Design a protein around this nucleic acid. Structure first.
Ligand SMILES: [Mg+2]
Ligand SMILES: [Mg+2]
Ligand SMILES: [Mg+2]
Ligand SMILES: [Mg+2]
Ligand SMILES: [Mg+2]
Ligand SMILES: [Mg+2]
Ligand SMILES: [Mg+2]
Ligand SMILES: [Mg+2]
Ligand SMILES: [Mg+2]
Ligand SMILES: [Mg+2]
Ligand SMILES: [Mg+2]
Ligand SMILES: [Mg+2]
Ligand SMILES: [Mg+2]
Ligand SMILES: [Mg+2]
Ligand SMILES: [Mg+2]
Ligand SMILES: [Mg+2]
Ligand SMILES: [Mg+2]
Ligand SMILES: [Mg+2]
Ligand SMILES: [Mg+2]
Ligand SMILES: [Mg+2]
Ligand SMILES: [Mg+2]
Ligand SMILES: [Mg+2]
Ligand SMILES: [Mg+2]
Ligand SMILES: [Mg+2]
Ligand SMILES: [Mg+2]
Ligand SMILES: [Mg+2]
Ligand SMILES: [Mg+2]
Ligand SMILES: [Mg+2]
Ligand SMILES: [Mg+2]
Ligand SMILES: [Mg+2]
Ligand SMILES: [Mg+2]
Ligand SMILES: [Mg+2]
Lengths: 173, 96, 242
RNA sequence: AUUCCGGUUGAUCCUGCCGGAGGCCACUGCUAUGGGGGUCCGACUAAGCCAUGCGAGUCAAGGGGGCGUCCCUUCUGGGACGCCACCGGCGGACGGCUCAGUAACACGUCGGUAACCUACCCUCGGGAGGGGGAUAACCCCGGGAAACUGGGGCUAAUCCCCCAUAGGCCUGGGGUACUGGAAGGUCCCCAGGCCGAAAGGGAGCCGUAAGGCUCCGCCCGAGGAUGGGCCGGCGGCCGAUUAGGUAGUUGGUGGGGUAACGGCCCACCAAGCCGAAGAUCGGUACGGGCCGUGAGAGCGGGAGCCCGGAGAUGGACACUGAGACACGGGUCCAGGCCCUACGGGGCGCAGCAGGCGCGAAACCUCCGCAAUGCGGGAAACCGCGACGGGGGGACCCCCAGUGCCGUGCCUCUGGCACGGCUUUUCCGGAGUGUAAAAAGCUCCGGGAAUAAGGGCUGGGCAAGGCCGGUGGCAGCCGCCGCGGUAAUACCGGCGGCCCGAGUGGUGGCCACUAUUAUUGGGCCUAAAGCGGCCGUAGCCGGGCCCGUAAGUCCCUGGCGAAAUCCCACGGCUCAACCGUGGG
């Protein structure tokens, strides 16, 4: 036979030029300041996979199905996508916007460390943001709920000084 | 730099002690082998002639480094057990 | 093997009972012929280097072995290819520790700490039994070793009994029969590492192996092959088991 | 996403095929800043031919010698020390490479050997007595163009050969101790034969010596282990414009041969054996784990990693050995090729690099035994193009860049002007990293500086009814269709759309396709019911009662290697990747 080949983590659209899909995706790309379509498609795929696991677990029974059922719920609430008292049916009401709100870029903008989404992306890439004492330079990293509030400027960054000129302009917003 | 000792283990079969440690140093370069050895021998009361540093490793976005060192009770046992390259790289002996 | 014996072993094809990282390197140690079989033992180098951690590289593990620091069943072993198997005792006298080699609930080999006193005895299941020249009896054990008994004793030993032996002197001190009410420890199969008492024994025609029903502590009955059931006591264990 | 859209008419509804839209693989146009991870790169044509270097050694604690530095005395020597080759031992049957042959017990899977071999390793029970012999090295003399190779002298062993004992094998007669489901097996006692062991060797101390005390060793027997041989049931391609095939063929009796059962091979006696449920013959092809695609049912493939098989230019055949009819060992024939002083003598990279040829189609004549392992050694160690490390390459996958902020002006998407900020990436340094280097990672100085393309623009199908050329010419066109001097469709400018370090062209498989239909299609008029009927095998078969338990359903033992797939947790900054558990 054939040895393993590493496969793409995202899926492409079945037709490249459908007007309604193009409009919807353009709105999302503008709002969250993503770099290209594949990035967006990556997140879409993540969502699909979650739903596909819930659809299979609803129609299953036995002992391993229960363990998998509780593991899916536990992982979803660890990422912060569901509240602590959610049930399996709630998996089927998740939207693409729920996942994008968990990007480190979005969360850095939401907390008020930057003035714009674009500035948040540059702050992440240049190495000015620390997450639980560690510097991470990937704007697409999905932030867990347990570490969301320990997100600050890096202690060696120029921005870790309340008198820095660019930080004062960020604070004025 | 600030050094923290994580584990000290006794290996009687080889005749040495094995020491794992961390170094905290925000805003500074990776510490040199000589400085680490001096600080370690002061911190543990070791004969520096039989103290070998296995490695010092830094990580991607961290302010600390992890390190591993070994201390022999006898010089001849050290020369018999350790490879030549590590003793040269640590300045214990001279490369021919 | 086109023309001769194989002398190499790839990591990916290593036995499933070893604790070994299968993708870290290309090659594994091909064990030397010896006491146990391939499915129930492991080379001594992985005990010194990988399990205990007394050495970092193969070269300094070999120097430790050549100086005579490790004992297996009371005897000095220097070969890094030597197979160490089920029910053996691994002894380190310079550190004063002793272990018994036993399978896991998943079928993997592990080291169980024991007392210094219990380290003197090894249980041996009787695998086969035969007549030998001079009209004496030879007993062939599960670890491949052998013992001789006089013809007058022929009714005190049968296949599947266990003999507790003092090592390294190799002196018999107790015979444990295979019968109902005996205490057994499972060594292979789906129910590996479970233990209990014997309830019933069943046989079949044309050479199909015989099966045993066993009651555990919590009161559940399960079956296994008779040759997978290793007698360890009368109604209580005579060795320490997890 | 369990999906449709364009094309037969002046207009309509059908059948039906072609085209568009998706994924993956191989070649290829134009164009390219950074890093990380991986099982990627002369497989398709030529299992074609190969210059040069390398890909298998190791032991001085088995044995006599050569030579050197030193110590005691030395006329002479004895010691110790360190290199050299030779005799001797073990390995060289593994590992590495390729897929030509093969439709077969080759492979997968469950069983069998009471019909068998096994050096190295483990346990237990025993043994090591007496004799003999040559020869390499070394010295004399040489031959031959060379590859090679001759005579004489002398010498040792864990080298070789004998004698004894132990032991082994065959057959005949008794006894019943063992294992097993079952004894042509094991064990005991008589009897006739044949074959027939061993190195008390080596090293170090206590020894005044005598002799111990360790370590490494030698031979036989019983069992195991390891590596194999042989056998059976079951499972997996295409063709009837191949219908009959086989004659050691099928079985029996008596032998031989083999490690071993067997028409495996002989002598003799019979007529068997396979076949329309597809023999035989022909075609194509290494088998599996797996891989591509699809909602699934399915359809297609099986180079790369693991396990099994086969081969070393083609066809035959032997020696040594535990193991071979042996890729870097031997013989013959055939076919190429190299060196010859012409008498002769040699060589096949389907090992790693490298060259030529073939083609649409594939890299450096580099560094290391530090890691993982293998062989040798009592050990420290030594060797290894296995393996590890880098060099070249739009191989696959994961994560980033080609600036950011404020205030003004414009055609307000975005471009320009001011003011400020940052340094992923870039340039120069220190440390860490590494066998040594390089990358990577932590810090310091400089500075928005060093970084965007490809295709498309009439419909399908997102995007112009603008301008300049050409004028059924040139050209475009997957399909439908454009172009005949006022072209939204050709060429070019300016605009616009899609994707983006990529984006287009060509060929293949799946999907599209319910155009292969078990799930699930059709046959009055569109492709399609034999002109009609009788009947053999096969398939399909009426109601009730009793039995069985093959099919069928439920529970539980032994199996279906690892890698690959799904889930949670943990380690590399997260991920890709890797580990621990569940499936
Ligand atoms: Mg294959
Ligand atoms: Mg049997
Ligand atoms: Mg018509
Ligand atoms: Mg079509
Ligand atoms: Mg070729
Ligand atoms: Mg050879
Ligand atoms: Mg070979
Ligand atoms: Mg054929
Ligand atoms: Mg078979
Ligand atoms: Mg067949
Ligand atoms: Mg004799
Ligand atoms: Mg016969
Ligand atoms: Mg072929
Ligand atoms: Mg095939
Ligand atoms: Mg290949
Ligand atoms: Mg060739
Ligand atoms: Mg190529
Ligand atoms: Mg090449
Ligand atoms: Mg050895
Ligand atoms: Mg349109
Ligand atoms: Mg075209
Ligand atoms: Mg015009
Ligand atoms: Mg144009
Ligand atoms: Mg139809
Ligand atoms: Mg009709
Ligand atoms: Mg009829
Ligand atoms: Mg009926
Ligand atoms: Mg049944
Ligand atoms: Mg598996
Ligand atoms: Mg981490
Ligand atoms: Mg993770
Ligand atoms: Mg893994």
């Amino acid at each position: 036979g054939d040895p393993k080949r590493q496969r793409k983590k995202y899926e492409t659209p079945p037709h490249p030029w459908i007007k309604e899909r193009l409009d919807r995706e353009r709105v999302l790309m503008d709002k969250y300041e993503l770099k290209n379509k594949k990035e967006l498609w990556k997140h879409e795929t993540q969502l699909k996979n979650f739903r596909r696991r819930a659809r299979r677990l609803l129609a299953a029974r036995g002992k391993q199905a229960e363990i998998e059922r509780e593991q899916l719920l536990a992982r979803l609430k660890r990422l912060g996508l569901l509240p602590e008292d959610a049930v399996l049916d709630d998996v089927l009401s998740l939207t693409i916007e729920d996942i994008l709100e968990r990007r480190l870029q979005t969360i850095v903008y939401k907390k008020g460390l930057a003035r714009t989404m674009r500035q948040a992306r540059q702050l992440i890439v240049h190495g000015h943001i620390e997450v639980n004492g560690q510097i991470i330079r990937s704007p697409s990293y999905l932030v867990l709920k347990e570490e969301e509030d320990t997100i600050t400027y890096a202690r060696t960054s120029p921005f870790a000084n309340p008198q820095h000129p660019e930080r004062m302009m960020i604070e004025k917003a | 730099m600030e050094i923290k000792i994580t584990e000290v283990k006794e290996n009687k079969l080889i005749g040495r002690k094995e020491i794992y440690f961390e170094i905290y140093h925000p805003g500074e370069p990776t510490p040199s082998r000589k400085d680490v050895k001096g600080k370690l021998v002061a911190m543990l009361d070791l004969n520096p002639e039989t103290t070998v540093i296995q490695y010092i490793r830094s990580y991607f976005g961290s302010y600390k480094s992890k390190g591993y060192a070994k201390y022999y009770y006898d010089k001849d046992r050290m020369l018999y057990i350790e490879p030549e390259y590590i003793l040269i790289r640590d300045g214990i002996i001279e490369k021919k | 093997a086109r023309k001769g014996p194989k002398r190499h072993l790839k990591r990916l094809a290593a036995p499933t009972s070893w604790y070994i990282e299968r993708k870290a390197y290309k090659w594994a140690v091909r064990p030397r012929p010896g006491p146990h079989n391939m499915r129930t033992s492991i080379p001594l180098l992985y005990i010194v280097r990988d399990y205990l951690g007394y050495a970092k590289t193969a070269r300094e593990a070999r120097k430790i072995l050549n100086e005579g620091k490790f004992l297996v069943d009371g005897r000095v072993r220097k070969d890094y290819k030597f197979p160490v198997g089920i029910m053996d005792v691994v002894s380190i006298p310079e550190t004063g520790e002793h272990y018994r080699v036993l399978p896991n609930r998943i079928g993997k080999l592990i080291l169980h700490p024991i007392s210094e006193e219990e380290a003197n005895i090894k249980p041996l299941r009787i695998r086969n039994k035969r007549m030998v020249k001079g009209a004496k009896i030879q007993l062939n054990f599960h670890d491949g070793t052998n013992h001789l008994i006089p013809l007058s004793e022929k009714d005190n030993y049968f296949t599947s009994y266990t003999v507790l032996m003092k090592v390294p002197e190799r002196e018999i001190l107790e015979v444990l029969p295979f019968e109902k009410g005996a205490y057994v420890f499972v060594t292979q199969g789906k129910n590996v590492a479970r233990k209990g008492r014997i309830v019933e024994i069943k046989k079949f025609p044309m050479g199909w192996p015989d099966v045993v029903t066993i009651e555990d502590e919590e009161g559940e009955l399960f079956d296994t092959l008779k040759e997978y059931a290793f007698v360890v006591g009368r109604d209580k264990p005579r060795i320490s088991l997890p």
